[PDB]
Amino acid sequence: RSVQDEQGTFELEAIPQRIVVLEFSFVDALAAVDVSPVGVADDNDATRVIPAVRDKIEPWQSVGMRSQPSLEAIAVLKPDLIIADAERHRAIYQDLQRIAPTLLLKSRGETYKENLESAQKIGVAIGKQAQMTQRIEQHKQTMAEFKQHFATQETIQFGVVSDKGMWLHSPVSYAGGVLSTLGIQSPLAPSEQKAYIPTSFELLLKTNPDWLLVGLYSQPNIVDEWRKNPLFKLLTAAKKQQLVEVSPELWSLNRGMLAAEEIARNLEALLE
Amino acid sequence: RSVQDEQGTFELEAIPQRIVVLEFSFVDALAAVDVSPVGVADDNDATRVIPAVRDKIEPWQSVGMRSQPSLEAIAVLKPDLIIADAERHRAIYQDLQRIAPTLLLKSRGETYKENLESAQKIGVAIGKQAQMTQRIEQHKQTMAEFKQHFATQETIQFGVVSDKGMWLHSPVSYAGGVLSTLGIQSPLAPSEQKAYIPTSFELLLKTNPDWLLVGLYSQPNIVDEWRKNPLFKLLTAAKKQQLVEVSPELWSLNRGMLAAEEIARNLEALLE
Amino acid sequence: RSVQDEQGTFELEAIPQRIVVLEFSFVDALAAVDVSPVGVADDNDATRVIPAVRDKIEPWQSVGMRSQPSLEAIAVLKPDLIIADAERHRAIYQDLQRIAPTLLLKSRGETYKENLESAQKIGVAIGKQAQMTQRIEQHKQTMAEFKQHFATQETIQFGVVSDKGMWLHSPVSYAGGVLSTLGIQSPLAPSEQKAYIPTSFELLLKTNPDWLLVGLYSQPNIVDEWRKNPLFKLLTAAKKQQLVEVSPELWSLNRGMLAAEEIARNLEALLE
Incomplete structure (x- = not known):
């Protein structure tokens, strides 16, 4: 399974069982398909991730702050997949790759459209392309339905x-x-x-x-x-x-x- | 028949039969109710008024520039109502009042909503309040129907x-x-x-x-x-x-x- | 069985057993020949379809608004025939064809005679051409019976x-x-x-x-x-x-x- 991330091409054969994500948008994509990451950079406060994401997944172990992830904490969790922010983790990408295969996607500074595109790439890397595609379609239909219910020109x-x-x-x-x-x-x-x-x-x-x-x-x-x-x-x-x-x-x-x-x-x- | 204009209150007892207007938007309001002014400040080129307005009304006599209309030519037309621009013709307002009852309304610098409010006041001054009120309602629905027909987000x-x-x-x-x-x-x-x-x-x-x-x-x-x-x-x-x-x-x-x-x-x- | 809709030929081999329609007149045609669609675009209010149509068929599963139907809800129903409005659902026509064979007929903007012709084409497509032909002939005789019952010049x-x-x-x-x-x-x-x-x-x-x-x-x-x-x-x-x-x-x-x-x-x- 192969996707295009911000360093070029990311490929993975085995289905990753232990995922460590370094940004909140990556937890959202995993939670939308009932996948619980074993590690999250939650800035040492898990409540910074919204309950709608946490209600769908088991608790995780913190790997520190998003700006400065603890590679020591990530390594102890023994991941088979790391999902890093392009902007936030370019310096540690090579360091993260020695721990586990590292997917380098954009989150900080992403648009709404880029977020859905990164969610689809995440679904391929974890081996849930069909389930992630379906969940993205359901999301677009849900948003289109809220837009139908909203009838205001207020700013x-x-x-x-x-x-x-x-x-x-x-x-x-x-x-x-x-x-x-x-x-x-x-x-x-x-x-x-x-x-x-x-x-x-x-x-x-x-x-x-x-x-x-x-x-x-x-x-x-x-x-x-x-x-x-x-x-x-x-x-x-x-x-x-x-x-x-x-x-x-x-x-x-x-x-x-x-x-x-x-x-x-x-x-x-x-x-x- | 009394209306509020930019000067205060304007009143007319008889229906005006010979109207001279000094802005293009006044011709528009009159033409929208099938009323032909005898004089128009058209800058000596009647094509400066759109064909959609001229198609609805009789030919007029030019009274010269909008910025400096000929009181001589206005007086020659023997008007019983003069519709002047509050901004352009403030200095000649009293000279116009000696020729005929002068209605002082905003045209230059008006917004879309202000233009429709002046058209209603014109309809009251000329004795066609009922027909002008209906024409404005018909206009508001024609624009809303174009709005529903249009389906583009292009700038x-x-x-x-x-x-x-x-x-x-x-x-x-x-x-x-x-x-x-x-x-x-x-x-x-x-x-x-x-x-x-x-x-x-x-x-x-x-x-x-x-x-x-x-x-x-x-x-x-x-x-x-x-x-x-x-x-x-x-x-x-x-x-x-x-x-x-x-x-x-x-x-x-x-x-x-x-x-x-x-x-x-x-x-x-x-x-x- | 072959019919002409808005691109000439639509064809099915087997009788459709799970029909989803995307417009109200399509429900009327099916109900007239005692065929209950499994899915209807009822704008989330089944009472928008008149009781004379609803009382003749089984309850259905809603697929959303007629203007923007939920392809997700249509796919979940697993239909073998989709009857779409020509004008409304042109942009999603191929998307619907991926779910099930899609009959694309006119309903919005149709006349009384065009509606009867579209009803005949539905009867052929669903395998009830003979019954629809006789039901349409019964409709015209019923309307003629009301016409010869009326004797009024009141507008x-x-x-x-x-x-x-x-x-x-x-x-x-x-x-x-x-x-x-x-x-x-x-x-x-x-x-x-x-x-x-x-x-x-x-x-x-x-x-x-x-x-x-x-x-x-x-x-x-x-x-x-x-x-x-x-x-x-x-x-x-x-x-x-x-x-x-x-x-x-x-x-x-x-x-x-x-x-x-x-x-x-x-x-x-x-x-x-």
């Missing part, structure tokens, strides 16, 4: 907030790609190239989204300071009480089929 | 071109409001506050609309110069031969129900 | 009403085709060429049908607004309490022999 915008500031997730980010697939309108430029936009108070006023969904990375954060500005109450999301705090793990960290379906259910619960 | 952008540059009409321009009413996607930011955008060749490449509709104000123009750049062939409208010369009268000089329905038909002919 | 007009307006169905529409077959006179001009006429209250006053049958699509609707006008009481249908609410599913969504005969029984009941 909906997600962004992460912290004491450092606010970063909006544009149509090109994963969360934006999920909203575009669901027919949800965006208040940002159609030609926006950056997935994460450093957001000033002026841009938030200029954008003025009908729904502002915020994932909190700290308490207090930049919104608490912006609320002290008298102009903040003029925002549509403030008047209509449509500035909602959502799960930062879901909207910002957990790209995948199970998260995209959770985002749609979360959005349905918010549109009523 | 369509109109701009005026001359030897001095190109000015794109944004969603907040009149042409943008017509395209937005018809559900046609814009390649520019939804938060763009400017109606007309001075456009360089670099901004056209960044925008890169699927369809680029150009209204020529001069021949040759700046697009003829941009075509010599080898990068021009890389534009989508260049590759798919979707850079169409459209009527500059319809898209930049004429506003109203009849103009908006011509744009819809012109759009239906370009798309299919 | 009867059906239209769909909603909050967005009213649309009268002319003799060139299906509903008007059933009425013409029954020898019922139309209040419109016999020259009328359009099937669905967008209708204002002023157009309704001028038309003034003896009977106005309305298929309610929304509540409240435009007829609720028109009732506030005192001129509404001048309508003949208002003076005689002959403004009757009829099934929107029957008169607007369902076409076929069983639907046309229900309209005939509905008319005879109203006229007594």
Whole structure:
């Protein structure tokens, strides 16, 4: 079985029984086909993976942080397959390959379309191409059905907030790609190239989204300071009480089929 | 019969039989209810009013430029109602009132919605409130039916071109409001506050609309110069031969129900 | 068995035992010959198909919306015949052919006579050509029996009403085709060429049908607004309490022999 990953070509003959994944989107793809990875780089907090993914798989052993995986922890788990992030693990790819065959796919900075493509490649590598293809079709039909149920032209915008500031997730980010697939309108430029936009108070006023969904990375954060500005109450999301705090793990960290379906259910619960 | 205009309140007792109008959108409103003005500030070229408006009404007598209409020729026509532009003809408002009761309405700089509100006020001033209210309802349904007939996500952008540059009409321009009413996607930011955008060749490449509709104000123009750049062939409208010369009268000089329905038909002919 | 649909030849050898249809008129044709489809695109509401059709067949499994049916649900039913709408399901035609042999017939936009011809083609395809031929001959005699039972010159007009307006169905529409077959006179001009006429209250006053049958699509609707006008009481249908609410599913969504005969029984009941 052979796929094209970001280093060229990845091939594997045996069905991998012990998989260690180094990014959350890889856990999502495995969980969608009832495969439990033996190791996950969960930043030493398994709750950073959404419950919709964890409810479908057995617990795993942490291999540390996504930015700095512990190759010592990975080796002790004795994997037959490693799924590494292209961006995050280029430096350790050769090191990981000596532990086990390493599949090098994109997750950090992936679009919604690229995520589904990486899920299909993961299904081939683990020996579940037919089951992964089927599950991807079910996902596309499910999203298309949520899009039919959504009948709003309101602009909906997600962004992460912290004491450092606010970063909006544009149509090109994963969360934006999920909203575009669901027919949800965006208040940002159609030609926006950056997935994460450093957001000033002026841009938030200029954008003025009908729904502002915020994932909190700290308490207090930049919104608490912006609320002290008298102009903040003029925002549509403030008047209509449509500035909602959502799960930062879901909207910002957990790209995948199970998260995209959770985002749609979360959005349905918010549109009523 | 009393209406609110940009000057305050305007009233007329008798139905006006000899109407002189000083903007193209006023001709549109009158022609939409089969009313022929005796005088039109047509800049000494009646073809600057679209055929869809002139087909509906009798020939008129020119009263000169829109920016400086001939009070002499207006007075010769012996009008009982003068419909003037609030922005263009503020200085001559009192001179016009000495000739005939003068209705001061917005035309230059109006949005799509503001244009329909002025048409309703024109219908009340001329004693055809019932017929104008019905024509506006019929117009709103014709546009909604084009919106349901159209089924494309392609970006369509109109701009005026001359030897001095190109000015794109944004969603907040009149042409943008017509395209937005018809559900046609814009390649520019939804938060763009400017109606007309001075456009360089670099901004056209960044925008890169699927369809680029150009209204020529001069021949040759700046697009003829941009075509010599080898990068021009890389534009989508260049590759798919979707850079169409459209009527500059319809898209930049004429506003109203009849103009908006011509744009819809012109759009239906370009798309299919 | 070979039939012509919209590409000439569709052919099956064995009698289809598991039939999935993607449009309401296809259910009517099957039910008319006592054939229960195992799958129907019922827009997730089986009551959108009239009881005269449903009471004759077994319960079915829904495959989703007519506009975007779920190929996953169609495949799960394991059909040996799929009857698809020519206009709606052209883009998914080959996808359906991979599940089962796909009969591609016209339903949306069909006339009364075209529906009967499509019903004959369904009977041949499912192995009931002789029974369908006699059922269609029974349908025409039943309609003729209703026509020779009626002796009225009263104009009867059906239209769909909603909050967005009213649309009268002319003799060139299906509903008007059933009425013409029954020898019922139309209040419109016999020259009328359009099937669905967008209708204002002023157009309704001028038309003034003896009977106005309305298929309610929304509540409240435009007829609720028109009732506030005192001129509404001048309508003949208002003076005689002959403004009757009829099934929107029957008169607007369902076409076929069983639907046309229900309209005939509905008319005879109203006229007594």
